[PDB]
Amino acid sequence: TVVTQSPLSLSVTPGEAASMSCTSTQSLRHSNGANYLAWYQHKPGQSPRLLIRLGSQRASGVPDRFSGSGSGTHFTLKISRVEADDAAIYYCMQGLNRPWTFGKGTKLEIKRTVAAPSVFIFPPSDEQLKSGTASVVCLLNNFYPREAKVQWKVDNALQSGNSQESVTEQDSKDSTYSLSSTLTLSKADYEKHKVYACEVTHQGLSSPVTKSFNRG
Amino acid sequence: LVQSGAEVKKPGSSVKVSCKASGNTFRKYDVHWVRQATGQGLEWVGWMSHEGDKTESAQRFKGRVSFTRDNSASTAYIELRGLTSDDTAIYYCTGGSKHRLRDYVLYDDYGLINQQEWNDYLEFLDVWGHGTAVTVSSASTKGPSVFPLAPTAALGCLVKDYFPEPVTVSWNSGALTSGVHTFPAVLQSSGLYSLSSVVTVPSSSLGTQTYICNVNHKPSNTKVDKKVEP
């Protein structure tokens, strides 16, 4: 018995309604008319918190903006007047049939105005270069939305498959993101080339932004 | 609740993780275990009833887990085996509310119960713990190497090739909680991790102001205060 959440991600301007949906194959309604679908929130680096139990009932501390709803196979969590504190991943969990299964989850993020990133490039330290490896890092700073593409270029050659990036969780204050991409290379192959550029592509920019440096 | 600390295990070994309750929270509540891997979500693993008469797991764990409790009633213990790198996750013990209900009954000619069936139904999981992260890997403990990132400007530190997680990076010993950005670590082909931490300051202060990142990798007793200047 599989329960599926929809949509996968949510974009809510603060102070708005946010409606989700958990849909189960078999019914979740015990013969006593109690639906056994609980809702949980999970903010990163934290323990998950129960907010809606038995379909509609609220637990201790949950404000009445979080309203559980639905019956049978169609349930729905609704967050009204969302705040930045409510951006999280919300999980519905069925409790009728064994085995008990969690839901795939629905991620909630704060909708914002488009913000372009500020780009920086960092050549490998001379400290690191004595170890035989070279690590070039490109910094993406305070942009929204999350969608962004970086293209490493070494002597005007598009690098693919040798870098590694990572984005921050959405900022509590400005509701932006930040990406760090690390192009890695050997000390020998770092020294065969001169121009290291970082071409950033984001819908906050008119044209792609390239930030380069030269060996020496 | 108070779980045990992070553990590191080679693929194919076993982990035992602890959980402790406040007073007798373990007999007013059932004991569950939920995990969450890297790209994964919340995933129920198994449970064990405070009455003590039922112990069940998720399907994937049948044959690998064993859920026991200290019969002083105080401590819960999960044991997982056949360890994959997929079994690398934060493991949460938690309480639970179950409804033990009778769904079927049949009485004989004498009025006695001839047949009956009682079933447990999960109402909610509450009072969670802090999660015991388990890392299933081949690598060994490794202190990181800290490198400077140097050119309104940006600058930071590069924490390279450490194992396992976590690593904290403070700036100016906590004086700087503005303009900083510490990123998720990435898992390398070496089996080791590399994380970056930067701060965005104006260049007019680069000559006047000091910027020292504080790096602490507790698994290998590696603490480094690295000062960053262009």
3-state secondary structure B144-191: CEEEEECCCEEEEEEEEEEECCCCEEEEHHHCCCCCEEECCCEECCCC
The domain of B213 spans: 139-229
Q: How many domains does chain B have?
A: 2
**What's the CA gap between B224 and B215, in Å, rounded?**
5
In sequence order, the 6+-apart residues with CB closer than 8 A to the CB of B175 are none
CB pairs under 8 A between A and B: 130
Q: Which of B150, B151, B199, B195 is nearest to B171 (CA)?
A: B199
Radius of gyration of chain B from its Cα atoms, rounded to whole angstroms: 24
Residues B25 and B131 in one domain: yes
Q: What is the DSSP letter of A32?
A: T
Which residues on A lie below 8 Å from B156 (Cβ)? Answer: 122, 139
**What's the CA gap between B156 and B182, in Å, rounded?**
9
Residues B112 and B1 in one domain: yes
**Which 98-137 residues of chain A touch chain B by CB within 8 A?**
98-105, 118, 120, 122, 124-125, 127-128, 131, 135, 137
B200/A93 Cβ within 8 A: no
Q: How was this structure determined?
A: X-ray
Would you list the domain boundaries of chain A?
1-111, 112-216
State which residue of chain B sits closest to A214, comparing Cα positions.
Answer: B151
Secondary structure (DSSP) of A66-133: EEEEEETTEEEEEE-S--GGG-SEEEEEE-SSSSP-B---EEEEE----BPPEEEEEPPPHHHHTTTE
State which residue of chain B sits closest to A89, comparing Cα positions.
Answer: B41
**E strand or H helix that includes residue B28:** helix B25-28
B196/A131 Cβ within 8 A: no
What are the φ/ψ torsions at residue B44 (nearest 5 degrees)?
-60, 140
**What's the CA gap between A142 and A182, in Å, rounded?**
18
Closest CA–CA distance from residue A150 to any residue of chain B (Å)? 16
Which residues on A lie below 8 Å from B182 (Cβ)? Answer: 168
Residues B100 and B147 in one domain: no
Resolution (A): 2.9
Strands B66-69 and B113-128: unpaired
Which residues on A lie below 8 Å from B128 (Cβ)? Answer: 47-49
A30/B101 Cβ within 8 A: yes
B124/A120 Cβ within 8 A: no
Count of CB atoms situated within 10 Å of the CB of B26: 23
Residues B100 and B151 in one domain: no
Phi-psi region of A81 (alpha: psi -120 to 50; beta: other; left: phi over 0): left
A167/B186 Cβ within 8 A: no
Residues B132 and B150 in one domain: no
* Three-state SS at B48: strand
Residues B65 and B124 in one domain: yes
**What's the CA gap between B93 and B3, in Å, rounded?**
7
**Where does a domain end: B112, B138, B164?**
B138
Which one of 1.20.1250.20, 2.60.40.10, 3.30.70.120, 3.30.1240.10 gives the CATH number of domain A1-111? 2.60.40.10
**Chain B interface disruption, residue of A2, A41, A50, A56, most B CBs within 10 A:** A50
Residues B64 and B157 in one domain: no
Task: Find out whether B213 and B170 touch, Cβ atoms under 8 Å.
Answer: yes
B34/A48 Cβ within 8 A: yes
Residues B113 and B150 in one domain: no
Which residues on B lie below 8 Å from A135 (Cβ)? Answer: 147, 158, 160, 194
Q: What is the CATH number of the domain that holds B157?
A: 2.60.40.10
Residues B122 and B144 in one domain: no
State which residue of chain A sits closest to B93, comparing Cα positions.
Answer: A47
**What's the CA gap between B147 and B22, in Å, rounded?**
44
CATH code given to domain A112-216 = 2.60.40.10
Which residues on B lie below 8 Å from A168 (Cβ)? Answer: 181-184
Q: Which of A59, A101, A164 sits opposite B126 (nearest CB)?
A: A59
Task: Find out whether A9 and A18 touch, Cβ atoms under 8 Å.
Answer: no
Residues B23 and B106 in one domain: yes
**What's the CA gap between A215 and B79, in Å, rounded?**
53
Residues B79 and B146 in one domain: no
Residues B220 and B122 in one domain: no
